[PDB]
Amino acid sequence: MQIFVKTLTGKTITLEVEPSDTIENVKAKIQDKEGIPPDQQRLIFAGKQLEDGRTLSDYNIQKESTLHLVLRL
Amino acid sequence: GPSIYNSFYVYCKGPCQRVQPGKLRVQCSTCRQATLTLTQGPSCWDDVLIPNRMSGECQSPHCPGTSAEFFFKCGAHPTSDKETSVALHLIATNSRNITCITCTDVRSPVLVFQCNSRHVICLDCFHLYCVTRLNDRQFVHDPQLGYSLPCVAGCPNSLIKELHHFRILGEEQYNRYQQYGAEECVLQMGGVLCPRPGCGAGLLPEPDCRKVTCENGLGCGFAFCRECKEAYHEGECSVDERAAEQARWEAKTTKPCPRCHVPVKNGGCMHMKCPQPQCRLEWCWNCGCEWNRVCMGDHWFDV
Ligand SMILES: [Zn+2]
Ligand SMILES: [Zn+2]
Ligand SMILES: [Zn+2]
Ligand SMILES: [Zn+2]
Ligand SMILES: [Zn+2]
Ligand SMILES: [Zn+2]
Ligand SMILES: [Zn+2]
Ligand SMILES: [Zn+2]
């Protein structure tokens, strides 16, 4: 499936994922595209900071749903 | 035939883009095939939500499968095997005929809160409840759950766990809720958003640091005070109580079988089996017919 990672800037990145993908994998996928290290990445959905050892299915994140990215400095 | 009563509601993203009745489906959690023969059919929602909670035996020889996986699909269009909708599990058909706590009318379907009194609100009122609260930034932020709301009546321990219930906001308001939740998450984390207009980019600076530079090149990029939100300076900064009673989800016993006509209910599980040996029929408590596929899909269990 495909999800959208939106920064609060409005900046939207398109990612190809699967429900089995862990947040850890998702962050690595973001690093592969944008180049932001996962260590600086904090992904939020439904207003919860998503944990690395949970999958998109765990968070019930649906096809073409939208994640939020916040940076740690 | 099987009655067109349904107990399960989902949110269809395409093309219904609204909340529709849902179909319940099941599989061996191991082979992802339709081969799991359930020991006992589901009776509560917990059975169809908590994973590996329902047990059985996968009929494939290759599987060692012993657990059932429950998925939900739309109940309004031809659904591909891949098209799973998120099941909103607080929504139920108002068979009991109860009253929206906000609007004091019998409506259906309704959303039953997990508050201690199992309060009922209709979806329309729930909508207004979420719309006012969301924009008034009066949504709760539990860092362990996310952005949510409790019982309208303010009951304790009632915060909505499945945050997909907030699709009742509608696409514009839901998308906002997604933003508002992320915004509030950063702030309450002690993080800051960009003060510059057209940026708003969330930042989580070093716990003790007044100098925040909004910075791949994806930053503001602008430096500011973590306090007064100016360019970093070395200088100094600058519900009706009655309607709540009549809106409780708990405020049929036994029926004879269509054959042995001997009286028989297993929790909310609508799958009934005639106990008499010359009978031994599988029948639906609601539909009234012989246990079938549609009955399974529409209302395997009831609330
Ligand atoms: Zn639909
Ligand atoms: Zn199997
Ligand atoms: Zn209402
Ligand atoms: Zn309540
Ligand atoms: Zn910025
Ligand atoms: Zn200052
Ligand atoms: Zn019988
Ligand atoms: Zn039935």
Numbering used by the authors:
A (entry chain D): 1 to 73
B (entry chain C): 139 to 353, 356 to 378, 393 to 405, 413 to 425, 427 to 465
Sentences from the paper on this structure:
Parkin is an auto-inhibited ubiquitin E3 ligase activated by dual phosphorylation of its ubiquitin-like (Ubl) domain and ubiquitin by the PINK1 kinase. Parkin is an autoinhibited RBR family E3 ubiquitin ligase consisting of an N-terminal ubiquitin-like (Ubl) domain followed by four Zn2+ binding domains RING0, RING1, in-between-RING (IBR), and RING2. Like other RBR-family E3 ligases, Parkin binds to an E2, and ubiquitin is transferred from E2 onto the catalytic C431 residue (on RING2) of Parkin before ubiquitination of lysines on target substrates. Furthermore, C431 on RING2 is occluded by the RING0 domain of Parkin, which inhibits Parkin activity.
